Design a binder for this molecule. Structure first.
Ligand SMILES: [Zn+2]
Length: 645
């Protein structure tokens, strides 16, 4: 659906800067208009209140373009008088998108006076004084709870003359209290408008004389992982290809041997082969385990699937970006079919059929026709293992060959020949390479998000959420490979791609500490290189914060860590660290959930309140906050933390 204008904030044209709202449509009008994308309402003023189905924020017209934040609007169209208006500009790096302003809208114009005295206009038509502190930052004269700024993303910062200085995008907070604001400066918008609207990154980059980072955006099946490195090698270059999937990596190796007649080096935890060839396929995980870039080893490093937002890929790519030039590489290629801001479009081979309630098998509130999976080989994506186990069972007793696949299981449980219905989490994507007669998609994913909850420190929350465009296209791509395919779905849309949560940075420090012998300072260097690089997935910059947390977690119990590592669940370092503090106090873990299984054998000797460090799940035991590590982390919570509004 489209973003819809539901009101405006009218600004005074003389005297002191003041504002007032005008609400132009209600909930029903908004939803209808979002669906058609056709909005016949008169548009007035320059600051628009806009809404999607779920959120509301602001959009500001400057120089004839209606601007707002990517984190709010994603790549969505804007409902307009002649139908949906497509974005003219989408800049995920800057968190800024623009639509050509619909007729009737007035525009603000850039400030010429250079004043440092700014005024932020909120969705409630408050006018808030802000002292400019740098290109994109300003301090609030009166700090306010961050809730006060929520839904004001996309609103203008004005100079005392009422001209545009920039567009509000995030609040910098000290323990939930906004002390400063982050905004996209107007000169970035001016530059955008002077620059091309259309760009092409589909051709393999030429190898420059000196180090460059380049992007390769090219369709699945275009040969990014195979054809491209083989060509570079044919030209005399040494090439490293990094991929998030062990199965894919091992597969590229076999394919190159039997096709281009070269047996590449292969580097994975399960299988490492040195052939001396000028091409090496590695996982990001094994590359990190190997210590990153070997001096003089490669001319070209291709970071394959560079849109991937798992912590291993991010840490791996940050490592390449920080080390490649010094290691003597000439080219880093950031390769993906789905770069930030990309959206899924129709595929010639794949018919997409919405599920209905007519069907013999209940599926995520809808139903699957038993006749749709009866003959053949099929893939059903579920959000969880528990759901895979259930739906499988509803098939082993209902008379069908069906197996569940998810993290922890061996790939051979999936038959490669014979009729089958595979029921899997996204773990499939990196464990198994094959394709299917059809794909059925629940259209939801499990994700982790950090909450700076101060109770006492932070919480990592696990929730099920609607899939993003990357998820949709990757799940859908498991069918229609070279031959006719069918994609059935529960919900039609997709969340915007190219963004990831601060909890993922937490996971990077955790892996640095648990697996790769990286000090948190070293981890920060690698993650900074990633964050400093345009065209990659984006995230809030919480590096100093996470570094400070892990820096204090010293003298972990080596045995507990060895166990959490092998068990393969998330946050092995944070888990083993909480277990260490508990064991040393002879205190019970936060609960007896399986997360805490390394303590189970000690159960009869653990008593009293848990010295709680942070929250990674439900806490059922009574807690104490007196432990020095708890106090240390609480102190860490005082850091400036930028959060979107
Ligand atoms: Zn001015």
């Amino acid at each position: 659906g489209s973003v819809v204008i539901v009101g405006r904030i009218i600004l005074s044209g003389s005297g002191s800067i003041t504002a007032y709202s005008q609400q132009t449509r209600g909930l029903l009008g908004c939803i209808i208009t979002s669906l058609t994308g056709r909005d016949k309402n008169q548009v007035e003023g320059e600051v628009q209140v806009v809404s999607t189905a779920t959120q509301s924020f602001l959009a500001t017209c400057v120089n004839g373009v209606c601007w707002t934040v990517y984190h709010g609007a994603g790549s969505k169209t804007l409902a307009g008088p002649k139908g949906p208006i497509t974005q003219m500009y989408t800049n995920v790096d800057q968190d800024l998108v623009g639509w050509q302003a619909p007729p009737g809208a007035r525009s603000l114009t850039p400030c010429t006076c250079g004043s440092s005295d700014l005024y932020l206009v909120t969705r409630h038509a408050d006018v808030i004084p802000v002292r400019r502190r740098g290109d994109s930052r300003g301090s609030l004269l009166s700090p306010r709870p961050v809730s006060y700024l929520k839904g004001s993303s996309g609103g203008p910062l004005l100079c005392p003359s009422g001209h545009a200085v920039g567009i509000f995008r995030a609040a910098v907070c000290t323990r939930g209290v906004a002390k400063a604001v982050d905004f996209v400066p107007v000169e970035s918008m001016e530059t955008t408008m002077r620059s091309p609207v259309f760009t092409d990154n589909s051709s393999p980059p030429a190898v420059p004389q000196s180090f460059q980072v380049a992007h390769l955006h090219a369709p699945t099946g275009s040969g990014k992982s195979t054809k491209v490195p083989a060509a570079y090698a044919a030209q005399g270059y040494k090439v490293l290809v990094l991929n998030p999937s062990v199965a894919a990596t091992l597969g590229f190796g076999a394919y190159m041997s039997k096709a281009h007649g070269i047996d590449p080096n292969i580097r994975t935890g399960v299988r490492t082969i040195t052939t001396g060839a000028p091409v090496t396929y590695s996982t990001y995980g094994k590359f990190l385990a190997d210590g990153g870039c070997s001096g003089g080893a490669y001319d070209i490093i291709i970071c394959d699937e560079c849109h991937s937002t798992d912590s291993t890929t991010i840490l791996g790519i940050g490592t390449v970006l920080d080390q490649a030039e010094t290691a003597g590489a000439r080219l880093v290629v950031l390769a993906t079919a789905t770069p930030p801001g990309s959206v899924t479009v129709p595929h010639p081979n794949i018919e997409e059929v919405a599920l209905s309630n007519t069907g013999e098998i209940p599926f995520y509130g809808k139903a699957i026709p038993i006749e749709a999976i009866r003959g053949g080989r099929h893939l059903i994506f579920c959000h969880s293992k528990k759901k895979c186990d259930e739906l499988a069972a509803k098939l082993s007793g209902l008379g069908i060959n069906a197996v569940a696949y998810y993290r922890g299981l061996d790939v051979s449980v999936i038959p490669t020949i014979g009729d089958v219905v595979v029921v899997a989490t996204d773990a499939l994507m990196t464990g198994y390479t094959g394709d299917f007669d059809s794909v059925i998609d629940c259209n939801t994913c499990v994700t982790q998000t950090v909450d700076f909850s101060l109770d006492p420190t932070f919480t990592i929350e696990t929730t099920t959420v609607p899939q993003d465009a990357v998820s949709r296209s990757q799940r859908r791509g498991r069918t229609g490979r070279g031959r006719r395919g069918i994609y059935r779905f529960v919900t039609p849309g997709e969340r915007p791609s190219g963004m990831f949560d601060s909890s993922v940075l937490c996971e990077c420090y955790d892996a640095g500490c648990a697996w790769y012998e990286l000090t948190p300072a070293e981890t920060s260097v690698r993650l900074r290189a990633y964050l400093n690089t345009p065209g990659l997935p984006v995230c809030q910059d919480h590096l100093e914060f996470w570094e400070s947390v892990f820096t204090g977690l010293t003298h972990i119990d080596a045995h507990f860590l060895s166990q959490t590592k092998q068990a393969g669940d998330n946050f092995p370092y944070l888990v083993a660290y909480q277990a260490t503090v508990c064991a040393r106090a002879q205190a019970p873990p936060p609960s007896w959930d399986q997360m805490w299984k390394c303590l189970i054998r000690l159960k009869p000797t653990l008593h009293g309140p848990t010295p709680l460090l942070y929250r990674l799940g439900a806490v059922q035991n009574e807690v104490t906050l007196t432990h020095p590590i708890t106090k240390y982390i609480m102190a860490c919570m005082s850091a400036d933390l930028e959060v979107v509004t």
